[PDB]
Every structure is written in structure tokens, then in C-alpha cells.
Amino acid sequence: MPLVYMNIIMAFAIALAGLLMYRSHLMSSLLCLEGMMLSLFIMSTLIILNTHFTLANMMPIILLVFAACEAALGLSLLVMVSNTYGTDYVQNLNLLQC
Amino acid sequence: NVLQIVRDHWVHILVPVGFVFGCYLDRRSDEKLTAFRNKSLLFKRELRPNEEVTWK
Amino acid sequence: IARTFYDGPEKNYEKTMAILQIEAEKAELRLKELEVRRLMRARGDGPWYQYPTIDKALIDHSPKTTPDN
Amino acid sequence: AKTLLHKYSDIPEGTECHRKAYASTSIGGATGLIVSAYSIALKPPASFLEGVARTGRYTFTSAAIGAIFGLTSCISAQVREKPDDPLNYFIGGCAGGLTLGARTRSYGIGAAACAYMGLTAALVKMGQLEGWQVFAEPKV
Amino acid sequence: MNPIIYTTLIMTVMSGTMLVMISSHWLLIWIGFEMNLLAMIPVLMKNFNPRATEAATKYFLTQATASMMLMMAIIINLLYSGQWTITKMFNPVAMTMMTMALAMKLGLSPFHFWVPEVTQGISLQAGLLLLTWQKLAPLSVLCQISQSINPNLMLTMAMLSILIGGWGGLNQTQLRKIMAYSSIAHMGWMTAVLPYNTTMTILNLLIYITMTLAMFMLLIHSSATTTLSLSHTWNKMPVITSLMMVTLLSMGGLPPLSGFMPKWMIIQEMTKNESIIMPTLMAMTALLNLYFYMRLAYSSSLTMFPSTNNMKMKWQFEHTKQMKLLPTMIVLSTLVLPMTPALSSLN
Amino acid sequence: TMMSGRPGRVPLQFLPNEARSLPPPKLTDPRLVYMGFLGYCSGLIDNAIRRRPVVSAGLHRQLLYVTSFVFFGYYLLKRQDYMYALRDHDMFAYVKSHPEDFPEKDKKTYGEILEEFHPVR
Amino acid sequence: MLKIIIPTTMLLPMTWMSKHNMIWINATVHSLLISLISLSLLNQLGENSLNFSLTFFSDSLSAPLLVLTTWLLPLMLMASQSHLSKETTTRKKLYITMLILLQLFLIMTFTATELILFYILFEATLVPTLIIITRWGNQTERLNAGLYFLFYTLAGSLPLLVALVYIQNTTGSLNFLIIHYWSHPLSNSWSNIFMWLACIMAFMVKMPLYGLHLWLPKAHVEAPIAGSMVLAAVLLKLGGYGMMRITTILNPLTNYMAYPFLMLSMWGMIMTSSICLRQTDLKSLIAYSSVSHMALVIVAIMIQTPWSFMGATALMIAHGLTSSMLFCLANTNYERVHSRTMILARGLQTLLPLMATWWLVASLTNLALPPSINLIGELFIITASFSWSNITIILMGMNMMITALYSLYMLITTQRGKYTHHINNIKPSFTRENALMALHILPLLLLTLNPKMILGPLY
Amino acid sequence: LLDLIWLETILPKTTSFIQMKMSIMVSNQKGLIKLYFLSFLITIMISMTLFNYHE
Amino acid sequence: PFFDVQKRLGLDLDRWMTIQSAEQPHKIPGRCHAFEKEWIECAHGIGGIRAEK
Numbered sequence A: 001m002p003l004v005y006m007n008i009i010m011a012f013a014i015a016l017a018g019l020l021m022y023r024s025h026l027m028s029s030l031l032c033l034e035g036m037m038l039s040l041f042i043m044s045t046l047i048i049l050n051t052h053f054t055l056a057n058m059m060p061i062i063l064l065v066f067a068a069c070e071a072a073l074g075l076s077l078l079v080m081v082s083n084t085y086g087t088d089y090v091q092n093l094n095l096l097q098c
Numbered sequence B: 001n002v003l004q005i006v007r008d009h010w011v012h013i014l015v016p017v018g019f020v021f022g023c024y025l026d027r028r029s030d031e032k033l034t035a036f037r038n039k040s041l042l043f044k045r046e047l048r049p050n051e052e053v054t055w056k
Numbered sequence C: 001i002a003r004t005f006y007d008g009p010e011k012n013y014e015k016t017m018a019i020l021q022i023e024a025e026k027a028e029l030r031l032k033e034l035e036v037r038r039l040m041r042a043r044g045d046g047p048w049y050q051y052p053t054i055d056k057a058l059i060d061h062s063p064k065t066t067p068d069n
Numbered sequence D: 001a002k003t004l005l006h007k008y009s010d011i012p013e014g015t016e017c018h019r020k021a022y023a024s025t026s027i028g029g030a031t032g033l034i035v036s037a038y039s040i041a042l043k044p045p046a047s048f049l050e051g052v053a054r055t056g057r058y059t060f061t062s063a064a065i066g067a068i069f070g071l072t073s074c075i076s077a078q079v080r081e082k083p084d085d086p087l088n089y090f091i092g093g094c095a096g097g098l099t100l101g102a103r104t105r106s107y108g109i110g111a112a113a114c115a116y117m118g119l120t121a122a123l124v125k126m127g128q129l130e131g132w133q134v135f136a137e138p139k140v
Numbered sequence E: 001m002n003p004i005i006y007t008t009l010i011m012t013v014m015s016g017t018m019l020v021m022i023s024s025h026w027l028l029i030w031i032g033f034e035m036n037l038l039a040m041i042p043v044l045m046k047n048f049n050p051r052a053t054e055a056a057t058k059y060f061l062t063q064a065t066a067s068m069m070l071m072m073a074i075i076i077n078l079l080y081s082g083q084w085t086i087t088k089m090f091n092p093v094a095m096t097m098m099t100m101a102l103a104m105k106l107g108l109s110p111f112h113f114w115v116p117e118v119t120q121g122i123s124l125q126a127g128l129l130l131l132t133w134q135k136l137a138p139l140s141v142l143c144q145i146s147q148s149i150n151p152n153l154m155l156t157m158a159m160l161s162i163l164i165g166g167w168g169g170l171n172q173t174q175l176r177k178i179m180a181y182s183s184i185a186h187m188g189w190m191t192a193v194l195p196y197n198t199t200m201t202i203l204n205l206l207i208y209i210t211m212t213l214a215m216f217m218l219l220i221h222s223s224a225t226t227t228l229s230l231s232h233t234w235n236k237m238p239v240i241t242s243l244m245m246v247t248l249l250s251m252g253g254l255p256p257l258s259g260f261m262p263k264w265m266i267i268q269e270m271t272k273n274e275s276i277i278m279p280t281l282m283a284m285t286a287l288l289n290l291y292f293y294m295r296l297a298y299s300s301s302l303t304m305f306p307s308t309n310n311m312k313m314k315w316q317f318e319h320t321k322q323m324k325l326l327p328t329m330i331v332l333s334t335l336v337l338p339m340t341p342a343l344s345s346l347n
Numbered sequence F: 001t002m003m004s005g006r007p008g009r010v011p012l013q014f015l016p017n018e019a020r021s022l023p024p025p026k027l028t029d030p031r032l033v034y035m036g037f038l039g040y041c042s043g044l045i046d047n048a049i050r051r052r053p054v055v056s057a058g059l060h061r062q063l064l065y066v067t068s069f070v071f072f073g074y075y076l077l078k079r080q081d082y083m084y085a086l087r088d089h090d091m092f093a094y095v096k097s098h099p100e101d102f103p104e105k106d107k108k109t110y111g112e113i114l115e116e117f118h119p120v121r
Numbered sequence G: 001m002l003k004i005i006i007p008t009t010m011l012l013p014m015t016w017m018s019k020h021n022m023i024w025i026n027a028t029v030h031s032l033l034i035s036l037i038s039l040s041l042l043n044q045l046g047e048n049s050l051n052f053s054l055t056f057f058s059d060s061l062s063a064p065l066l067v068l069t070t071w072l073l074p075l076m077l078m079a080s081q082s083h084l085s086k087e088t089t090t091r092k093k094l095y096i097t098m099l100i101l102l103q104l105f106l107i108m109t110f111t112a113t114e115l116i117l118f119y120i121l122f123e124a125t126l127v128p129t130l131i132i133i134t135r136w137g138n139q140t141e142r143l144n145a146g147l148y149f150l151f152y153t154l155a156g157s158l159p160l161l162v163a164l165v166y167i168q169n170t171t172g173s174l175n176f177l178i179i180h181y182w183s184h185p186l187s188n189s190w191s192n193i194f195m196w197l198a199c200i201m202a203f204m205v206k207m208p209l210y211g212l213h214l215w216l217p218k219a220h221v222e223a224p225i226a227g228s229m230v231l232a233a234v235l236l237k238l239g240g241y242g243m244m245r246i247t248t249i250l251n252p253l254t255n256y257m258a259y260p261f262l263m264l265s266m267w268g269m270i271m272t273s274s275i276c277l278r279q280t281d282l283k284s285l286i287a288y289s290s291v292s293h294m295a296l297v298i299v300a301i302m303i304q305t306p307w308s309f310m311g312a313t314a315l316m317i318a319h320g321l322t323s324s325m326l327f328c329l330a331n332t333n334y335e336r337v338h339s340r341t342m343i344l345a346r347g348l349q350t351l352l353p354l355m356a357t358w359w360l361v362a363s364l365t366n367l368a369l370p371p372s373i374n375l376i377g378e379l380f381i382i383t384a385s386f387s388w389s390n391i392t393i394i395l396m397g398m399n400m401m402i403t404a405l406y407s408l409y410m411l412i413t414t415q416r417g418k419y420t421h422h423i424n425n426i427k428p429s430f431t432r433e434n435a436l437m438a439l440h441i442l443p444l445l446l447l448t449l450n451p452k453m454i455l456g457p458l459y
Numbered sequence H: 001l002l003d004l005i006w007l008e009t010i011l012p013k014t015t016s017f018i019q020m021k022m023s024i025m026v027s028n029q030k031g032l033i034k035l036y037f038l039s040f041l042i043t044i045m046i047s048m049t050l051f052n053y054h055e
Numbered sequence I: 001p002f003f004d005v006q007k008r009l010g011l012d013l014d015r016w017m018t019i020q021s022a023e024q025p026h027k028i029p030g031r032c033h034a035f036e037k038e039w040i041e042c043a044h045g046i047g048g049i050r051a052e053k
């Protein structure tokens, strides 16, 4: 496994760890999700380019599409959270504790 | 007089009918286990000239 | 009482013989089925536990713009 | 990982009680560390120092329990000249249970813990002897 | 929300699940999961309130993280073998990632935390959908790749799920959280038999879905979301509470009710392998689920709780809309054990 | 797992052609009668839930319930019987084609076998 | 044997379609007819069983139990129809449905020819009993009684299911006949030790064994009278039936695995028998006496000799009848004074003479007066135990003396002395109650006339 | 001493106490996704290190 | 779990992209086309259990 592959997988692991840790803002978590999408796109593109899988070249593109969908979804939700509290702090999302 | 008392006490035939049905079902069930009828080493006997089964 | 309500001993005797035969056959069949299943799962040579493999009808056998495929 | 269990198991049952005690306390420390990690993750301690205090407390309790269990079980097996017998394991487990009672400073916990741990330890020994599998490999 | 839009969203959720079910390509299964989640997010938010927004956000975050791990596992498998087909999954690291992603999607322990809160935060209709239909696609994927299931990891998660569901249900007063914890325990029972026989998994899934549908339709008929609000139902619908008690006993796993059939079979299957200790532990742990089912039955059917004066007015009105398939689901949820051998039509 | 991949299997058939070479379940099969009983119970529960006279509210819908349950049960029984027949066929063929794995052992009488005796006292 | 099973399933719709004021009459009449029909199973062979079909069979051990069940249902109806007078017709039909379902499950249980079906029905018996106790009990302790009963049963019964499926996979069958003919010895192994424990502990709990008996006083005291009757008479004997059916595969491990339980059964015999000496509640006294008698039966099964088995069968039948009668007698006083305290209503022989003689006859039967079948069973078990070990006679004789002591103590406390002065609502005994007592007690003496019918297959 | 205290204490009372304690421990969560996802990260690391290493 | 609708209907919804050796546009071959075709031909029809060894 080349060293660039290792760097891309390390980037994905870093983004996943960054998402699984929450500081205060939901936007930062959405950014970590987008970073995971970006690392997955780069990994898939490198694998498909190295092994000349011609018909697989549309696969990353489709990936990107659904990335946007997730992003869109998250952004929509964030708006609602803000409209309820005035901030996007994840600590306010504690109603379902009881 | 028959109609009203029948509509009142038709429930008293459910259990006798159930017992009759159970007897019939037991007969049907034990008519399926005849693979050794008149074939046992202890009860193998010659059939009579008029009968056809040792037991029903 | 014996004539009206009951039967002879031969009927129960032979019914018991038939029942015993059926249950013994079932027991031997269950043990055989367990052994067959173990062998088929271990080896994969039987009709059972045949996990799918890629269909060879999908391969394209045509010149590929490069002689060495 | 499971290599700790290997370092524990590769030592014969009634020999080298010091090495067996070391392996047992390693296993106990690992378990206590995992428990501390989950406890900190789910119940924050409101300060870093209190978190390290809770981690150290849990890890020390687990390590002491493991060390006492391993030492007592090995010593019993070696002295009694009867390995491959679950009484040694039961004795070690009860001793380990007693340690928990002393750590938490409670006679009920100690007494309750000792019986349960001893029973559990004996069952594990019987499973090792007979060949019971907790996670059976799919065979049929 | 418009009825046409609601129909379209439900159809999109179902089409995503079907796409996961009928696909042989990993990318198409991923796309089915994405479409399912995308259409599911608004359905949880049909009745707008801060609690619904909370539940939708938590569900979205969990499922998005699971989707990331799913895609990463797929890509690693592609890297180590240029295969897109859903098969044996030649790489073990990718296999562990896939198992964890699907477990997080299902709600198996220790990824269970979101299920009680999401269930409590949404309505009973959305809860029914979440706890019945959303379990099909991950279980289908898990069934297809059971040959590479690491028995240690899956069995650990299943036993953890059973233990956690049993313990968590004991502390609950709200009905939706009770249903969520019962769902977690049943998921553990379902996935425990997965490495050995997927037919048993499908049988347990069908029985669980029938019982859950019966329970949710009963809870919708009697508009109760708490224990004390369900304590009032005997004074208006005694028949509903009696049927609910029998259904609860069936979910508790008592014979000769339908809920006994799956676990029974599952136990037998693991006993065909060696696997003796685990089924024993699972039975003694399902005792906890039976306990809190019986507590609910005591509150709702076997005792008469105090009522209120206004209830008299409710005595004068019938139900405007009646849920079809409720009688059939009750019957299938209780009196079906004698037809146990018919499970042979599942493989 | 065990039967999902079997050679010559149509995916969504539910009833292969070879299944017609098996005896159909009788219309008085007790499992079919139990399915009809389940349909009757569903009809009665439907009557009770909608607050209608349980025994005699809707006879047409109760008949539809019973006939629907019997109808589904007939094909369910056919498929179950076919799958069990397939299991037996495959097991017998596998036994026949692997003789060294299923050898017929020597027959011994109880006069030759020595069983240990455990007195009760 | 469907000629008995189908008439009960017909008792169901007949009850549900009878008019409001004739449910009790129809149920009683047809239950009595069904018991008369079931009486035909007592014609047992001398060598093998009565193998009716592939699923049902009967031998000389299950036939008396079936007759006891079918006979007990009408008594339960007659005793129940008093305290349910103010109940609505629907819930009365529901109660009768619970009783009918219980009897049907018991009838199939006692004759199931394979172990998994026997287990399924043995556990199915739990649901009607639990519903009866927790829905029609009187005090607020009925909920806890139901919980204790259910969980005590299931905790011991689930490992039995695991062991049963294990045995079926290893041997290939669970049919009692194939199991008996193909039986093999159990080796002295830890795996075999735990298999023995799993096979035995469910029936131990159902007896109940001393130490696992804490559910029985709660359940039998908090239950309505029909629930108490079915619990004491029949549901306690499921453990004995299962024990004497499953011990055929546990040899020769039993020879040394019975050592703890025997002790728990012997010393426990004393302990529970002593508790009755200081009971301030009549129902609890009867329940603890049931515990001691069942301990004697456990000893009989564990020592595993033909005389012990005959004594165990006789004692099971005799205790069923006697305990049912005692519970009904106590319930009459309870409906009089609405209190279970023994010393509340005293000197009842002055006011209820015929009920006093019923009390005397029940107490005499309880303390094993010869030549009752109670004494026959107890004496056969005692002789078997003496053959087992000559030191057992000390414990058995201690138990006999304590049993006589508490039986006559209860009789003297309730019936003799002087009446309580302020209690003035003691009406004359009804025809229903006296008929119930007579129908309990006449079969006991008629059975000591011909005891071979309750002595089991070893006869 | 025996029937009302110790036989009660050993089997049902100890069982009820332990089950109630474990229920309180498991159920009582703060409701915050921060701690939940921290637990998810811990679980993922444990699974990767423990099960995956022993292929 | 898997409802093989494509095989039932002969549809080819996503099978064209599953492998490297299946009809790429302009007949562009994969880097490992020969090895993949050899493996698939060797493993065809014998099942996963046998084909692994």
C-alpha cells in the first residue's frame, strides 16, 4: 500500500474522530462530515484511477451528489435548532433526556 | 314450545357432540397405525375364513 | 365392560410397535440430517451452503484495444 | 488485546505464581482502564483531576482484584498439589471478591462479591477443562 | 403537511429499503440507505415541536456517521479486491467496519443510545415506522454477508443488546421508551442467531414486526403515551386492554403464544452448534423484558386504576377512524405457535 | 444460508414446477382447519374492537376472513411440504454419494455387548 | 384420547353462549360428565402404556392425575360461584374460561408423549393461573404473589428447555418410549452434572423444594379459592410427574447428585412442619403443610425404588384431595368473617356441627390416619427410606408427630373452645358447601377401598 | 429468621436489588449526544484493536 | 434479504459495474483484466466455500 493511500485513510480517521467529538457547534460537526465525504471521494478516485476501472469513474461523482444531500439535510436541521434556541449549541438538545 | 326451548338449550349438545367427534377422531388416528397388524411375533395368527382384519 | 368399552391387547400391542418404529426412524433421520449438514457446511460440495460466486457470463471476451488485455 | 490472556494461559497452572500474578494484574488493569474510559465518556467528572482520580481508583481496584485472584489461585493449586481442579479457582475468586469488599469498604459487597466471583471462577475452570465454548464457531 | 407529499415521502422510504434489498452492487445498497434516510428525516418531523427536531437531529447524525463508516468499509474492500458485488467481503478490517456501521444503523449495543430518545421524541406513527420498517435493510445486508461475520464481535453486541434492553426497560414510565428498549432486546435476539442460521433471523424479525405492529396500533387506538394515561383505558375500552395484555404476554415470550416460537427456535439452532452458555444467558435475561411487560399489564389490564369525571363524555363517542389489520395482527401475534413448522417456507 | 443458493432455483417463484410432483394437502388437513380457526378468531376480534355484536355482527366479513385465511394457508402448506421434501431429497442424495462418511457398522446383539451395571441402593 | 380433550374445548363455547343465569349449571353438569368419561382411563395394562396415537399416551401414573384434574374442575366451579355473585356475566364467563383452559392444558400435559410438548403445556399452565390470581384475588399482595410465582417457575424452567433441546440434538429423539428403551448411563462429568441440574431444577421448583418454596405461601394465600385448589391439588404434582418421567435418563449420576436435595427435603420437612405450629393465618398453615408433604414426595422420587415410587404416587393423589378440602373449609369461614386469622372465629363446632365433622375428617386424613391412602403413601415412602438408610426413621417420625400436632392444633383452635362473643353473622351452612365437602371426602375413602388404582406403574 | 429473612434475602431480594441497580445505571443518561458519540469512539477503537487484531 | 429481481426479469440494473472485466466503453481493459477473468472462470459455479480453497 503506497504512502498516499495511508495519508488518505489517516485523513478519514481524523475526520471521523473529529466528528465523534463534539465541542459546542453543530456546524463544526457538519464540516467534519463533509471532510469525511471529501476523504472518501479522494480514496475512491485514487483506487479507480490506479486500477483502470473505466465504468467505475462515474462512481465518485454519484458519491458527491449524495454528499450534498446529507449536507443539505444537516443544514436544514441546523436552521430549526437555531430557531428554537438562537444558538446551534448541541448542549441545548437535551430535552429527550427525560 | 319446541322453538324457544331449543333456542335456549341447544348448548347442551355441544359436549356430547364433542365426545362423539373425539371418538371418531381417535378411530381415524388409530387406523393409521396398522403397519404391524397381525404381524407381531406374539400375536401372529391365521385369519379366519370369514374375517379380514384382526382388529379395527 | 370389556366387550362394550375396550378392545383386545393385540391392538394396543401392534399400535405400540408401529409408533415405536416411526419414532425410531425419525430419530435416526434427525441424527443423519445433522451429520449431513455438518459435512455440507464444512466442505461446500453439496447442494447446501452454496454461497454465490461471480457469474462468468459477465466477462467480455473481445479485443481490448491492447493485445495483452 | 487477547495476547494478555495468552501470556496468562501459557504459564502452567501450578508453577511460577509470580508470573501468573503479574499476568492476572495486567488483565485486571486493562479491564479497569476500559471501565474508566467508558465511565469518563458517559459521566464527565467536572474536572480533569477528578477524572484522573476516578480512572486511577477504578484501575487500581481492578488490578488488585486480578492480582489477588491469580496469586491465591496459583498458590492453592501448587500447595494442594491438585491442579486441574476448580476449588483453587473458586478460592482465588472468593479472595478477589474479598478485595473488592475491602476496596469499597462494605461487608455485604465483599461477602456477596466473593460468592459470585468464586462461582464464576469455578465455572470458567470447568469450561476450560471440559471444553465449553462461549462463542461457538458455526459448524452446522 | 400535504397528504400527497406524505405519500411520496413514505414511498421514497420504502423504495430505498427495496433498493437495498434488490441490489447486488455495494454502491446501490449505499444509495438505498441514503435515499431511505433522506426521505425518513421529514417523516419524524411531521408534527413540529422542539422534541421532534431533537429526535430528527439525533437520528440524522447517527445515520450519517453510520453511512460514512459503511462507505469506508466498501472502499477498503474494493481496494483489497476489485469487487463491487455484495459477497464474502475479503477484507477483515473492512468487515469489522461494516459490522459496526450496520450495528449502529440497527441500534445494537453499545450504539443503542439514540433509539429510546428518537422513539420518545416522535409520534406513535413515526415510532411504528422507525421500529418496524427501518430494521429491514440493515438486517438484509447482514444476512447476505453472514459468512464473514466475526462470531465474537456480533455475539458480543447481541448479548450486550439483550442485557441493555432488559435493564433499561425496567426504569421506564413512558411507553415509547419501553417499546424502544424492547426493540433493542429483540434486535439482540435476532442478531445472536445470525452467524448460524439466517432463516431464524427472518422468522424472529417477522414475529417481532407482527407483535410491534399490534402493540403500536393498540397504543394508537387508545391514545396513550404514558403508563398512567394507559391506566384510564379500561374505563372506556376494556376489550382493547385485554387484547393488549395478551399481546404483552406474547411479547414476554410465554408459551403457547407466538412470541415463544422465535426464541425457542433460536435456542435450538445454537444448540445444534455447541453454544450452550449463551442461550441460557439470553433466556435468563429476557426474564427482565417479561418483568416490565408484566408491570405494564398490571397497570393496564389486571387492576382497575382510578379515573376522572370527564371520561363520562368519552363514553358517548366511538372511534372515527379504525385501523385495519389490527385484528389480524393481534391473532398472528398470539395464536400462531401450532403453525411453527411453516418456517420451512422461509429458506 | 443453507438453502438460499441451490442450483436451478428460480428467485421469486414460491412454487417450483417440480413441486407439482407431490401430493397436495387435503382440504380437511388439520393445519388448514387451524388456519380457518385463526380467520374466525380474527373476524370475532374485528367485531369486538368496532363495538359490534361479537358472534353475529357481520357474517359476510367473517366468511371473507375465514376463506382468506384458508386460501393463504393452502399454498403455505404446499410450499412448506415442498421445502421439507427438498431437504430430505438432498440429504438422501448426499448420503448416497459419500458412502465413506456414512458407513454401516457391525450389528451386535445385547448378548455380546457388555454394559456396566449400576445398582440402586 | 381426544374423546376427553375435545369435550373441554366444547365446554368453552357452551359457556360463552349460555344465558346469564345458567353458566354455573351447564359448566358443572358437563364437567361432571367429562370426569365420568375420563374415569375410563383407569383400566390400565400391566406391562406397557396405552399408546392412543403418536402424540398422546397414558400409563397408570398419569391416569389418576387426569381423573383428579377432571374431578377438581366441578369442585372449583361450585366453590367459585359464591364469591363471584356480584360479578358481571362477561367476567364470570372469563373466569370459567380461565378454569377450562387450565384443565385442558393439564389434560394435554399429563399425556404428552414427548418432552418438548410436555414442556410447552407445562409452561402454558402458567398463564391462566397468573391471570386468575392477579385479577380475581382479594388483597393487594396478589400482584407480588403472581410475580413470585411466575418468575420462580420460569427461572428454573428455561434451563430445562435448553437441556431438552440439547438432549434431542445429541440422542435424536425426546419421545418417552424411545428415551426409555435407548437409555444410556450418564458419566460423572461437570457437563453431565449441569445437565442433571438443568433437567431437575424446574421440577424441584415446582414441588417446591425447601429453599425455593417462598412463592408457594404467597401464591396460595393471595389466590381465590379456585386458584388455591388448582395450585395445591394438581399444579404441585406437575413437578412429580416430570421428575418421575425424566429421571430415567439421569442415572447413575442421581446416586450422588441427590445427596443435597435429599437433605433439603428431609430437614426442610421438619422446618416447614414446625412453621405450621406458629402460623396465625389458616391459609399459610395449609400451604406450609403442602410444602412438607411435597418434601416427602421429593425424597421418594430421589431414592428411586419401586416402593418409593408407589408411595410417591399415592401421596400425590392423597395430598391433592386433602389440601383441596382444607382450603375449601378455610374459605367457608373466610366468607363468614372476612378474616384469615385463626383465633378470630373460635368455637365453631357449637354453631356449625356438620362443618365441624368435615373439619375433623379433613384433619384426620391430613395427619395420615390408617387406612387412608395418605398413610399408605407416607408409609411406603418411609419404608423405602428406611431401606435407603436406617437413620432416616428419626426425621420421618419427628415429622409424623409434628404433623399430628399442628393438624389437631388447627382443628382445636378453629372448632373447639367458646365462640367469639361479638361475631353474630355466622349463618347456617349452605347445601352447596356441605355438598362440596362431601364430594371432596367421599372419593378419598372410596379410593382407600381400592388403592391399586393410585399406586402407579411400579405396582 | 429463615423463611422471612434469609431465604428471602438470597434469591429474590438480591435479584431485585441487583437488577434495579443495573437498571438505574444503564437508563440514567444525560441525554447529550456529546457523551454518546464519545462512547461510540471508544467502542470503535476497542473493536478495532481487540477483535480485528485476532483475525 | 436479497430478492434477486434482476435475475428473475433479466434486467441488469447494476451488474454492468460490478466487475472490471465486463464491457467497458470503447473496449478499454482493466489493469488486471486477465487475472480477474481467470479467477472468475475458475471459481464459477462451485460456490464460495469451495472457491475459497
Ligand SMILES: CCCCCCCCCCCCCCCCCC(=O)OC[C@H](COP(=O)([O-])OCC(O)COP(=O)([O-])OC[C@@H](COC(=O)CCCCCCCCCCCCCCCCC)OC(=O)CCCCCCCCCCCCCCCCC)OC(=O)CCCCCCCCCCCCCCCCC
Pocket: A013, A014, A016, A017, A018, A021, A022, A023, A024, D029, D033, D034, D036, D037, D038, D040, D041, D044, D045, D046, D047, D048, D049, D050, D051, D052, D055, D056, D059, H038, H042, H044, H048
Ligand atoms: C479508522 C478507524 C479509527 C477512527 C478513529 C481514529 C482516531 C485517531 C485520530 C484522532 C485525531 C485527533 C484530531 C482532532 C480530534 C478532535 C478532538 C476534539 O474535537 O475535542 C473535542 C472535545 C470537547 O472539548 P470542549 O467541549 O470544547 O471543552 C470542554 C472540556 O473539554 C470538557 O469540559 P470539562 O472540563 O468540564 O470536563 C472535565 C474534563 C475531564 O477530563 C478527564 O477526566 C480526562 C482524564 C482521564 C485520564 C486519562 C487516563 C490517565 C492514565 C492512563 C494511562 C494509560 C496506561 C498507563 C498504565 C496504567 C496507568 C495506571 O474534561 C472532559 O470531560 C474530557 C473527557 C474526554 C477525554 C478525551 C476523550 C478521548 C477518549 C476517552 C479517553 C478516556 C481516558 C481513560 C483511560 C483510557 C485508557 C488509557 O475535546 C476533548 O475531549 C478534550 C481533549 C481533546 C484533545 C485530545 C484529542 C486527541 C484524542 C484522539 C483519539 C484518542 C487517541 C487515538 C490514538 C489512536 C492510535 C493511533
Ligand SMILES: CCCCCCCCCCCCCCCCCC(=O)OC[C@H](COP(=O)([O-])OCC(O)COP(=O)([O-])OC[C@@H](COC(=O)CCCCCCCCCCCCCCCCC)OC(=O)CCCCCCCCCCCCCCCCC)OC(=O)CCCCCCCCCCCCCCCCC
Pocket: D105, D106, D107, D108, D109, D111, D114, D115, G211, H002, H006, H007, H010
Ligand atoms: C438453604 C437452607 C438455609 C440457608 C439460608 C440461610 C443461611 C445462609 C444466609 C445467612 C448467612 C450468610 C450471610 C453472609 C454474610 C452477611 C454479611 C453482610 O451482609 O454484610 C452486611 C452487614 C452490615 O453491613 P456493614 O454496615 O458494612 O457492617 C456493620 C456491622 O454491623 C458492624 O460490625 P462490627 O463492627 O461489630 O464487627 C465487624 C467484624 C467483627 O466481627 C464481628 O463483629 C463478630 C464476628 C462475626 C464473624 C467472625 C466469626 C465468629 C464466630 C464463628 C466461630 C466458629 C463458628 C462455627 C464454624 C465451624 C463449624 C464447626 O466482622 C468481621 O470482620 C468478620 C470477618 C469474617 C470472618 C468469619 C469467617 C467465617 C467463614 C465460614 C467458616 C465456616 C463455614 C461452614 C463450614 C461447616 C462445615 C461442616 O455486615 C454485618 O454486619 C455482618 C458481618 C460479619 C460477617 C458474618 C459472616 C459469618 C457467617 C458465615 C457465612 C457463610 C455463609 C455463606 C457462605 C459464603 C460466604 C462467603
Ligand SMILES: CCCCCCCCCCCCCCCCCC(=O)OC[C@H](COP(=O)([O-])OCC(O)COP(=O)([O-])OC[C@@H](COC(=O)CCCCCCCCCCCCCCCCC)OC(=O)CCCCCCCCCCCCCCCCC)OC(=O)CCCCCCCCCCCCCCCCC
Pocket: B014, B017, E238, E239, E242, E243, E246, E256, E301, E330, E334, E335, F041, F044, F045, F048, F052, F053, F054, F055, G009, G013, G016, G017, G090, G091, G094, G097, G101, G127, G128, G131, G135
Ligand atoms: C386451546 C383450545 C381452544 C382455545 C383457543 C384460544 C381461546 C379461543 C379463541 C380466542 C379468540 C376468540 C374471540 C376473541 C374476541 C372475543 C372478545 C370478547 O369480548 O367476546 C365477547 C363475546 C360476548 O360479548 P357480547 O355477546 O358481544 O355482548 C357482551 C358485551 O360485548 C360486553 O363487552 P364488555 O366491554 O363489557 O367486555 C369487557 C371485558 C372483555 O374482555 C374480554 O372479553 C377478553 C378478550 C379475550 C382476549 C383474546 C385475545 C386473543 C386470544 C388469545 C387467547 C390465548 C389462549 C392461550 C392461553 C393463555 C390465556 C390468556 O373486559 C373486562 O371486563 C376485563 C376483564 C379482564 C380479564 C383479563 C383476561 C383477558 C384475556 C383472556 C384471554 C383468554 C381467551 C378468551 C377466549 C374467549 C373470550 C371471549 O364473547 C363471545 O360471544 C365469543 C365466544 C366464542 C364464540 C363461539 C360461538 C360459535 C358457535 C358455538 C357452537 C360451536 C360450533 C357449533 C357446531 C357443533 C354442532 C352443533
Ligand SMILES: CCCCCCCCCCCCCCCCC[C@@H](O)O[C@H](CO[C@H](O)CCCCCCCCCCCCCCC)COP(=O)(O)OCC[N+](C)(C)C
Pocket: E203, E206, E207, E210, E258, E332, E333, E336, E339, E340, E341, E342, E343, E345, E346, E347, F004, F011, F012, F013, F014, F076, I001, I002, I003, I004
Ligand atoms: C405471525 C406470522 C407472521 C407472518 C408475516 C405475514 C404473513 C403473510 C405473508 C405474505 C405472503 C406473500 C409473500 C411472498 C408471496 C409471493 C412472493 C414469493 O416469490 O416469495 C418467495 C418465497 O416467499 C417468501 O420467501 C416466504 C413467505 C412465507 C411467510 C410465512 C412463514 C411465517 C413463519 C412461520 C410462522 C407460522 C405462521 C402461520 C401463518 C400465519 C421469495 O423467494 P426467494 O427469492 O428465494 O427469497 C429471498 C429471501 N430468502 C431466501 C432469504 C428467504
Ligand SMILES: CCCCCCCCCCCCCCCCC[C@@H](O)O[C@H](CO[C@H](O)CCCCCCCCCCCCCCC)COP(=O)(O)OCC[N+](C)(C)C
Pocket: D085, D086, D087, D090, D119, D122, G188, G189, G190, G193, G210, G211, G212, G257, G260, G261, G264
Ligand atoms: C436454596 C436451595 C436451592 C437448591 C440447591 C441445590 C444444590 C446444588 C449443588 C449440587 C451438588 C454437586 C455439585 C458438584 C459435584 C461434586 C461436589 C464438589 O465437592 O466437587 C468435588 C471437587 O472438589 C471441588 O469441590 C470442586 C468444585 C469447586 C467449586 C464448587 C463450589 C461452589 C460453592 C457452592 C455454591 C452454592 C450453590 C448455589 C449457587 C447459586 C468432588 O471431588 P471430585 O471427585 O474430584 O469431582 C467429582 C466431579 N467430577 C468427577 C465431575 C470432576
Ligand SMILES: CCCCCCCC/C=C\CCCCCCCC(=O)O[C@H](COC(=O)CCCCCCC/C=C/CCCCCCCC)COP(=O)(O)OCCN
Pocket: D119, D123, D130, D131, D132, D133, E274, E275, E276, E277, E280, G152, G153, G155, G156, G159, G162, G163, G166, G190, G191, G192, G194, G195, G196, G197, G198, G201, G205, G212
Ligand atoms: C428458582 C431458581 C432456580 C435456578 C435454576 C437455574 C440453574 C439450574 C442449573 C444450571 C443450568 C445450566 C445448564 C445449561 C444447559 C445444560 C446443557 C448441558 O449440560 O450441556 C453441556 C454444557 O454444559 C454447560 O456448558 C453448562 C454451563 C453453565 C453456565 C450457566 C451458569 C448458571 C449458573 C451456574 C451455577 C448455579 C447452578 C445451580 C444453582 C441452583 C439454584 C440455587 C455439554 O455441552 P458441551 O459444551 O458440548 O460439553 C461436552 C463436550 N465438551
